[PDB]
Design a protein around this ligand. Structure first.
Ligand SMILES: Cn1cc(C(=O)NCc2ccc(Cl)cc2)cn1
Length: 149
């Protein structure tokens, strides 16, 4: 599958992360990201997708080696880590037919897995509106502990 690139934006306290909420198949909350165009460099794709979904330009803030990358069902997703963005920043998507809402979430309150259905003796996982964000949460928490303390 085509690689995706975007960002994990944190505030100045490093407590909170910025998630966006799409529509339909993308109806839950997730980090801003999208598919790379032909010949486009990973940092440029990240900035483009982030600016389209949030109105915030990360290009002056990206650090090349500061990202979390996950391969999920043989598609690679790389989110550049962008700390220190003020919580009073005004975010507005360009793509308002694609983005319902944009919010800060407490990192410590976000799930890092979905819940099973063992109460009901049924296989699988319960729905969770943070499905797309979840795979990045534990790697983010570990990354912040190493790089800040
Ligand atoms: C299958 N699926 C994907 C998501 C997701 O990515 N959500 C955040 C988001 C990112 C970018 C845009 Cl444009 C819209 C929403 C949710 N469920």
């Amino acid at each position: 599958g085509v690689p995706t690139y975007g960002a994990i934006i944190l505030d100045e306290t490093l407590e909170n992360v910025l998630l966006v909420q799409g529509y339909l198949a993308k109806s839950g909350w997730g980090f801003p990201k999208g598919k790379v165009n032909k010949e486009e460099a990973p940092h440029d794709c990240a900035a483009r997708e982030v600016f389209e979904e949030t109105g915030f330009d990360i290009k002056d803030y990206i650090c090349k080696d500061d990202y979390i990358e996950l391969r999920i069902n043989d598609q690679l997703a790389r989110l550049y880590i962008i700390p220190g963005i003020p919580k009073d920043t005004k975010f507005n998507p360009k793509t308002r037919r694609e983005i319902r809402n944009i919010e800060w979430f407490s990192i410590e309150k976000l799930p890092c897995h979905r819940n099973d259905m063992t109460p009901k003796s049924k296989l699988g996982l319960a729905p969770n509106k943070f499905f797309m964000a979840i795979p990045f949460i534990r790697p983010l928490r570990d990354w912040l502990s190493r790089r800040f303390g």
